[PDB]
Amino acid sequence: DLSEGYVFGMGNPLLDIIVDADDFMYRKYNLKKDNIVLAEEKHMTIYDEIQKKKKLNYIAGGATLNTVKMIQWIIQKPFVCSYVGCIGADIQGKYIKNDCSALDLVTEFQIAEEPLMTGKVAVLVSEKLRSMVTYLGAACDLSLAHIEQPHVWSLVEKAQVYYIAGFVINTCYEGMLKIAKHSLENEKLFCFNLSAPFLSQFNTKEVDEMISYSNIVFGNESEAEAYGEVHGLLEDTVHATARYIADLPFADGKKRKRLVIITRGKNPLLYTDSSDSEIHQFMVEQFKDDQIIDTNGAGDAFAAGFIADYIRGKPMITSLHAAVKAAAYIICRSGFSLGSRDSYS
Ligand SMILES: Nc1ncnc2c1ncn2[C@@H]1O[C@H](COP(=O)(O)O)[C@@H](O)[C@H]1O
Ligand SMILES: Nc1ncnc2c1ncn2[C@@H]1O[C@H](CO)[C@@H](O)[C@H]1O
Ligand SMILES: [Cl-]
């Protein structure tokens, strides 16, 4: 029985535009496998280009939004989760706003001044490669002033659990930092995600600072390798990274338990904490090739699945199984599609 607004999240509300991309698209825009890049000017043509293609799938995205709204979806109790993001005054943001409302996710969306449109992600799907080109758009306009509003900040004060992806470093770092400081101050549960390799590479200061406030840190193999290399962890990078992140001092220099979970695709995930001396591996659900529909958002679902159980008192191993289940459910679906709740289990 969790109170209303028990879980709070802020991030980038984005519209995923999923397309069966031709192979030349990856060479043309210099896109890499399973990677994500913020759109530069040289990428801008990709949005009108994929628009000329048939069978586009428009579906609400945003890493933080995916996770938080699935937690709300899993819990089934109305208004247990609340989300804050910046959309634009267009039909895309209206769709995202109604999508959240449809599953009882409380939202205080900031609206970017026209004509700044809501962010969009070009999800290029092919048999050989999957890659994302993200245009943040309105999501950048997410301000501290909006968060510091009385009616908006009240959602933060009532919350006992926070989830903020590393992606929000590029849009509103002062906001997520102010909340992280509040969380650690009131001994709350702060959950953070490494989100992408480029964040550890180009925003190393912000990532490490967030970790110092985080009680639970999520990451995958590529993010662990990128993080480890930047921190000079040359030998056994992935394991050394998990240990390093768990062992980092908190901001107030107090002794707390920070949980770290590194996912590794089909391979067993790793986990440990600041008290544990060992790094444990946890096996994952095995898939046949024709069973895998779309792995995009699997990591977002994993976090949702774990947190939803963990904050309800479920043991570590039990919560890990729920996390895999959430990810596996998304894998069998195209985009971050949350179907009827009755068909989950
Ligand atoms: N190919 C896969 N086979 C089985 N599980 C997967 C696969 N890809 C992703 N997952 C699940 O989603 C989580 C996150 O995946 P990843 O972002 O690739 O590390 C994993 O820990 C698994 O629970
Ligand atoms: N820069 C970003 N900020 C927030 N979410 C993102 C970003 N790039 C991709 N995503 C989202 O990540 C999800 C995949 O985990 C997709 O739904 C996509 O919309
Ligand atoms: Cl986000």
CATH, residue 50 = 3.30.1110.10
One domain for residues 31 and 154: no
One domain for residues 56 and 190: no
One domain for residues 293 and 279: yes
Spatial separation of the C-alpha atoms in residues 185 and 287, rounded to whole Å = 43
Q: For the chain, how many structural domains are there in total? A: 2
Pairing of strands 216-220, 259-264: parallel
Q: Whose CA is nearest to atom 4 of ligand 2?
A: 62
Q: Angle formed by the axes of helices 150-158 and 173-185, to 10°? A: 40
Q: Where are the alpha helices (DSSP H) in the chain?
A: 24-28, 46-51, 63-75, 91-102, 144-147, 150-158, 173-185, 197-202, 204-211, 221-230, 237-247, 298-310, 316-331
Residues ≥6 apart with Cβ < 8 Å to 47: 17, 120, 122, 135
> Closest ligand 2 atom, CA of 66?
17
Spatial separation of the C-alpha atoms in residues 89 and 315, rounded to whole Å = 43
User: According to the entry, how was the structure determined?
Assistant: X-ray
Ligand 2 neighbourhood includes 16 CB (under 6 angstroms) = yes
- Which is it for the CA torsion 249, 254, 257, 261, positive or negative? negative
SS3 304: helix
* Residue ranges making up the domain that contains 289: 1-14+61-118+136-345
Ligand 2 neighbourhood includes 297 CB (under 6 angstroms) = yes
One domain for residues 188 and 330: yes
Ligand 1 cavity residues, CB under 6 Å: 220, 263-266, 269, 284-285, 287, 295, 298-299, 302, 324, 327, 331
One domain for residues 236 and 328: yes
- Look at residues 104, 135, 166 and tell me which one is the last residue of a structural domain: 135
CA of 71 to the centre of ligand 3 (A): 15
One domain for residues 10 and 47: no
CA of 288 to the centre of ligand 3 (A): 30
Spatial separation of the C-alpha atoms in residues 158 and 247, rounded to whole Å = 29
Radius of gyration of the chain (CA): 19
- Look at residues 84, 107, 135 and tell me which one is the last residue of a structural domain: 135
SS3 225: helix
Q: In the 8-state DSSP scheme, what is residue 334?
A: S
One domain for residues 70 and 154: yes
Resolution (A): 2.3
Spatial separation of the C-alpha atoms in residues 64 and 10, rounded to whole Å = 7
One domain for residues 41 and 86: no
One domain for residues 173 and 55: no
Q: In the 8-state DSSP scheme, what is residue 289?
A: G
How big is the CA angle at 201 (ends 13 and 34), to the nearest 5 degrees? 60
SS3 33: coil
One domain for residues 47 and 140: no
CATH number of the domain that residue 165 is part of: 3.40.1190.20
One domain for residues 261 and 114: yes
One domain for residues 131 and 226: no
- Look at residues 103, 135, 167 and tell me which one is the last residue of a structural domain: 135
Residues, CB within 5 angstroms of ligand 3 (ion): 11-12, 62-64, 165, 167
Q: Which run of H or of E encompasses 82?
A: strand 81-88
Spatial separation of the C-alpha atoms in residues 80 and 1, rounded to whole Å = 10
